[PDB]
Amino acid sequence: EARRAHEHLIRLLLEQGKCPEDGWDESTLELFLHELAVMDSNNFLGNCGVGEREGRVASALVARRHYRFIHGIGRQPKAAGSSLLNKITNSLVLNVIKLAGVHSVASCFVVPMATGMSLTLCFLTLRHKRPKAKYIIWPRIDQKSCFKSMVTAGFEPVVIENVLEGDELRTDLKAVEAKIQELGPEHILCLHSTTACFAPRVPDRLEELAVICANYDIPHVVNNAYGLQSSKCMHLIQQGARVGRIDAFVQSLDKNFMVPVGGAIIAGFNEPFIQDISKMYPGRASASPSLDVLITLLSLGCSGYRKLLKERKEMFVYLSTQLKKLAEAHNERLLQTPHNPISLAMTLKTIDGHHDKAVTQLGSMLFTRQVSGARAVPLGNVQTVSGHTFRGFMSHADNYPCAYLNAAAAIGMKMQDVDLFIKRLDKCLNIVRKEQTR
Amino acid sequence: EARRAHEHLIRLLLEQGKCPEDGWDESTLELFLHELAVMDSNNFLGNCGVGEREGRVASALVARRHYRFIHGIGRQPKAAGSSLLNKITNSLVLNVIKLAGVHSVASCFVVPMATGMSLTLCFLTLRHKRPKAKYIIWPRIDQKSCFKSMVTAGFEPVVIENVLEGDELRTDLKAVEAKIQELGPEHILCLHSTTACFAPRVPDRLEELAVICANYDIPHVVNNAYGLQSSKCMHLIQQGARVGRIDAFVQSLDKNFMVPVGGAIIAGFNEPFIQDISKMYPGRASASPSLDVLITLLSLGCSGYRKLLKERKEMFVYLSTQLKKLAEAHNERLLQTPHNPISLAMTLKTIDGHHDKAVTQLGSMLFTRQVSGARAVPLGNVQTVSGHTFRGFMSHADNYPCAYLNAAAAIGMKMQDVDLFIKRLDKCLNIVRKEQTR
Amino acid sequence: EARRAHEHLIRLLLEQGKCPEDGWDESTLELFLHELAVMDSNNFLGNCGVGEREGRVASALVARRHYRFIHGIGRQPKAAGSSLLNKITNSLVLNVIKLAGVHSVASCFVVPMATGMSLTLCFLTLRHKRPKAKYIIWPRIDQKSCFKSMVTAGFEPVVIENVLEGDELRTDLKAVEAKIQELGPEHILCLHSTTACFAPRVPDRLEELAVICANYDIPHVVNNAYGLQSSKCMHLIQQGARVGRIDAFVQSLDKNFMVPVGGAIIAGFNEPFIQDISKMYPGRASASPSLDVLITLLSLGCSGYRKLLKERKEMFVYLSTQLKKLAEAHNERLLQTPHNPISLAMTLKTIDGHHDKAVTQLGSMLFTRQVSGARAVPLGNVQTVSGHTFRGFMSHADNYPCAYLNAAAAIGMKMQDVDLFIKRLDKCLNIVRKEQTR
Amino acid sequence: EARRAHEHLIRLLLEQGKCPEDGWDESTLELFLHELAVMDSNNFLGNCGVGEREGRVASALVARRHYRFIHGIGRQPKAAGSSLLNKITNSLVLNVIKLAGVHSVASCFVVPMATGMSLTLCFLTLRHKRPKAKYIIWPRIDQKSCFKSMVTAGFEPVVIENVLEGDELRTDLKAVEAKIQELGPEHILCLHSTTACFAPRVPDRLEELAVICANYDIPHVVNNAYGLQSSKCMHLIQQGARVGRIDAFVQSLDKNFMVPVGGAIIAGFNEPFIQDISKMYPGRASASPSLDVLITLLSLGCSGYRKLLKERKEMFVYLSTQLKKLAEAHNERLLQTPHNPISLAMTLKTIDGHHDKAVTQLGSMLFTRQVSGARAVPLGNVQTVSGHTFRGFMSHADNYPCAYLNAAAAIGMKMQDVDLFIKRLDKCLNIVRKEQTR
Numbered sequence A, B, C, D: 001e002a003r004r005a006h007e008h009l010i011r012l013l014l015e016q017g018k019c020p021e022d023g024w025d026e027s028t029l030e031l032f033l034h035e036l037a038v039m040d041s042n043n044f045l046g047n048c049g050v051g052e053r054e055g056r057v058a059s060a061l062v063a064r065r066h067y068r069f070i071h072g073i074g075r076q077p078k079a080a081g082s083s084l085l086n087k088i089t090n091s092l093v094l095n096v097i098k099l100a101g102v103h104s105v106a107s108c109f110v111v112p113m114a115t116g117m118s119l120t121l122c123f124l125t126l127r128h129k130r131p132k133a134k135y136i137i138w139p140r141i142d143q144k145s146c147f148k149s150m151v152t153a154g155f156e157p158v159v160i161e162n163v164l165e166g167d168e169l170r171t172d173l174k175a176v177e178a179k180i181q182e183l184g185p186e187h188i189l190c191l192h193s194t195t196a197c198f199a200p201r202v203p204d205r206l207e208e209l210a211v212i213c214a215n216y217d218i219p220h221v222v223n224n225a226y227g228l229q230s231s232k233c234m235h236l237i238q239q240g241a242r243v244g245r246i247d248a249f250v251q252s253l254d255k256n257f258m259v260p261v262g263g264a265i266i267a268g269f270n271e272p273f274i275q276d277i278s279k280m281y282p283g284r285a286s287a288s289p290s291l292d293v294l295i296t297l298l299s300l301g302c303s304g305y306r307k308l309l310k311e312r313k314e315m316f317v318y319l320s321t322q323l324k325k326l327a328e329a330h331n332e333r334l335l336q337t338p339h340n341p342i343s344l345a346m347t348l349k350t351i352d353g354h355h356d357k358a359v360t361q362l363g364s365m366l367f368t369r370q371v372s373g374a375r376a377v378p379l380g381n382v383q384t385v386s387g388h389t390f391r392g393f394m395s396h397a398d399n400y401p402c403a404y405l406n407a408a409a410a411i412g413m414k415m416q417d418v419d420l421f422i423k424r425l426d427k428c429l430n431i432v433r434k435e436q437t438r
């Protein structure tokens, strides 16, 4: 019987909480969602509501687009279907974290805030654990949201400059320890490290930082914003947890799962602590990020997600081979950034140094040609963000040797993304050089 | 011409940013949304994306249900359509705040966090303005999210007990000032007052608190979670701003606009300050709450929203008349709470005092009968929430004179909500009394 | 339990096949549709298809918009869900025919052809019953589809001119009988009469025609295209069946049920005959009309449909009162057409007779002003349709005394339809008269 | 600019009426559909409607699922958007007919009836051209809809038995001519031939029939129900038109385009004649089939459709290779039917002849195992359909030599359709043989 086959799939999901190997048909998915929504009190046929939060909906377009899930999520029930939705979604995500390369993950939850505010929530929770602490030690990465996250939480970021090793910018482990000793471990809220990042920065030395955190008894929060899509980044987290201390790692829903911006996952190795972060959240929250990742994971299944991850690696190879060929044809080179598995950079030395803002102009030319996501990084940008002045802003160092153009192979990239980029970049560079050579 | 008529409506919205008097047809609305989405780079036909946040979507169900808005909202652009969506939505909401009764509002923004976290954001911003402050003075209201909001922000709530005046619980203005003097104004982050609330508590004495805040130079943040739907609550805020100091007022999207849980509006009278709160938010955020309230307001228009507000007042009268008749028929009474325009309470003295947990049982019986939102409040509940032990928890006082049942006429209530509630309550009370009388 | 309440509604529908008194919520409706679609083989999870009609769908937009019903309808099964959909829909429609005023209806079915082709199907079936017959006797009504229906079926229409009685055009019963006698009853395929029609024609004298058909042993097919919405029209059919012979009556889905054009209902009093018409249909047919009327009737319920019918009568009174006031203010009059319960006409004598095509111009002016559905009927139109030349075409007579403007109160009409029409008509008439009076 | 790129695609479609080489994004498609719907009067913001067919819609679910196209299609305008929809759709389909292999097609139109009723419409039109004719000469194919089509139209089918040539059943050209001479050409309405059909019948000898029709001056209507997906079938039609007479060819929308059952395309080589068939249709008709094929073709583009056609050929090879291997492993054989490009048959001699209804049982076993579309054809079925008794019904001959199982590779078939079929068939045959061998 037709209906029993759908029931079987739904039952296997409910009982184990695991991502199905193969993706569900849309029919099964919508049957499931409609069944869950029926469980929420706002949807009961016999319901009468006499409170201030009844999940009433004025617009049919709004009700429908959300599959009639109106009550949001929490951490007798007013929304039994939404609670089941939350629980299942968190189970699927824990599973996917394991699939992605952190097999020893203990606990996780979706929070419908993006990664910056999600990091803030971790810091807000740590405040109560460490009431003496005022500082967050942070290996520099020129991205405003993660920097702000510390200031928003009410802490003083201690910016640790990176080391130039060949073309790569890497964790200055000695500088990290020197600041710990200077300021006093009891005065440090946590170390706040970062995995996936713009080349030529690479993921932080998490093994070594984890040892430092263990030894000094300082919490360690990892900004894994877009590292979940990378088995290399995820292995770093796993290894870090094996050899030292990692208290939480945070990742974007949109960047790793191809869903709208708005949600993140907070995960860790100590269940009581991760639950403490969740409990620190005041009030109900949007169910929309959770619904998006639930639909996506059930539709892809383990196989579909694994396929995307494999395809990302394949596209990274393709982008790298194509960008290196282009670069060399224009007497540039691909920066040597073997430790960055997602992001890469070619030099822009041939257009830089003419005192004409050509590097910045190139970024603009790419944008006008409907290339999104490229970063043309010039030398000497100065920018002040929330009390800190960054010299060499965009380059994660005060004195990076050259200007460069940064592109990345993130999950969902297609051959046409690479091919169009290369075609357009070639044209733009030819235009700039023509203009510069009279 | 057909198309020009739609264009006219869209143009009038874009140019002025005001809520249309009469609601748009769905056709016009969807034309508009499709046009905005086209403006976002992820939707360009000629786009190639080479970054880590390209707004790629794996599931067609996810893409469609969000009208192809994937990039989220912020405070060259990657998402021009989403930015316009954000700007328009905030304009419409400012307009509606004026319509609702705070005509002098200067600035506001939708934040896709619910009201508890939105209050936290206000507190997080005030930390930087007042680095010496550790305390938040807070007239007691037994609701976990707003209490937590203070603790989550990293501040110590100073719980001010309420005064019993007749049947009402009201602001203890003398106790508020005594704590200000005891602790020192410079040590107070803000006063955190509350408008709409469970009867028999009533909205705080905002005029008087505003004078206190002005005189002591202490910020004043108003928890207006579900007060926007009440012209009486909104007038209180307006008057408060006229006679003293109010720095921010926060309201729920779901409770005042009949949309899913997940978003709130932060509003105030000083544009630089409100903008400072917005700037304190790290990173991009979900566009989903904004889209929901945009669809809702364009669909209702000013007239449709005004109608809902009028209907709410009419339903409050109906609920009050019906509940008083029921109460008196069971030898109970309607508590005299004229200062609460949304929430009301009947006594439960006839079932209380038998040492059998009958009051709590009644709440359970109502819930099992698909009555949502009623609160059966017994005497003597003790609960500890985030470091504070509340005696008489649920009753907003240690020693409220009697047990009671609390129901409310919130926006969107229907006659059947009242009628079914009354029918079911009558039956439940008859059952309990039968059991108690052997 | 929430789910059981939905099940109860679905079970009551499946067991009895009756229209629910009150309309279902959308949630219940979509649960039901999803459950039915699951029953169709194209939707089985374990299905493999090795035939030429597997219900495969290339576009997700197409699959979704049809609720995954792909197999169409017929009169072991490949589409058990679609067959149930067909059966239920026909049951609901039979019920509604009774509600609408033909209580003695025996059998009916939805056919996804519009009313003209549906009449053709009746004629095609009668051919086999009456192989000697070549003629269809037809009281004139100037509407191309019903006229064509006879020619398309391969029969010769015998056009019976109407009688002028006061302002009304009515059935010429003597002319009908004279043609029967002249041509011979055995040579007449059927009499083809019409109920709802453009004023000042009125519904045919069905009682008297039914007696004629009974006495001469000639089938009687009633064109009830838009009469189902009228209890007066429906009573005429009922009475006709009581006092004489009516073999089939046909009505539009779109005109009586506010759904897209495309379907009709064939109904009658002799089940074997109505089933013979259904059996005459070759092959599978679209399920889309049936799905539309099923969704509509379940959503309205008996109460919602009854309400629309009552509202139509109320709007007819309003349109008549408003149009008479307008007419008289312009020195015109409302034609006296008490026997037409839907359609009415005001005279246009004041603009006619200037040899300037003013009547036709008025129709054009109304159309340019976004008035749809009005008919400005001039004198002296000659048009040939499928072998017959109609003099006075549009007026259902060769020599109707005056030009007129025809408007109607059909199901779903709103006060604004009347008010805008009246406002626009007033302006147009003033313009024409100004132009004509130099 | 983003919007201009969509406009470009829409403009190129409107100006030329051709299928885009590459498929449109959904965004472009929905923009286009919303724009067309805006053009229909029921959707005008300023519209007032005072007629009986205003396209009013009671249910939002119905309005939305049809993209607000309510007025249907025809052959001043009430539905300018629907008329454009009809015109464009017919243009795209003409284009696709050329792509599919009838390059010389002159005219075509979508009719929202399935293929049986569409053939009826052709016959109904021919009646008026040939008022003396009563007979339709028809090479036998055991399919009820196409047989009925002739009877429904009011004509007497003259069933021409097929010739056994090897394993194939083919057109008996001599028998066709003998009947023409016996009955008289002037008494023949048309020859009604068939292309795609169940093996071991093969497509009719259209070249030879076309010569016969030309020479005798008898119209020729081709039942191309599921031949459009086959370049071999389409070439036969093209060649037939080149060497003789073909007046119309009819094909299913669902079987060739992977859309819901309900529509067909009537096409031919003489524009006035094809237009005469269209003009014979009385009244408005559903727009739903046209919308489905429009969405499908714009979404696939020429490339996507070409790909499906290529994939069908590839799947036919796979099905044939797999079914032959299975058959031979069970001591059966694949019937030699090289002239049938879609349908194939393996023998069932090993289970036949035990007087136990095993062949029919096998069909039932396959059906119970969720194999759809297989046909287990036994010897000796007698069935009477609309006045004709077919001996050997299902086998297209009175005395086909053996029982067989018929499977087909139609458009949209997947490898899993073949693989599951083969796995299930193997099991079923093993079960039957076990039962038969005690």
Ligand SMILES: [Cl-]
Binding pocket: A229, A230, A231, A232, A233, A313, A341
């Ligand atoms: Cl990797």
Ligand SMILES: [Cl-]
Binding pocket: B229, B230, B231, B232, B233, B313, B341
């Ligand atoms: Cl109020």
Ligand SMILES: [Cl-]
Binding pocket: C229, C230, C231, C232, C233, C313, C341
């Ligand atoms: Cl009536």
Ligand SMILES: [Cl-]
Binding pocket: D229, D230, D231, D232, D233, D313, D341
């Ligand atoms: Cl082929």
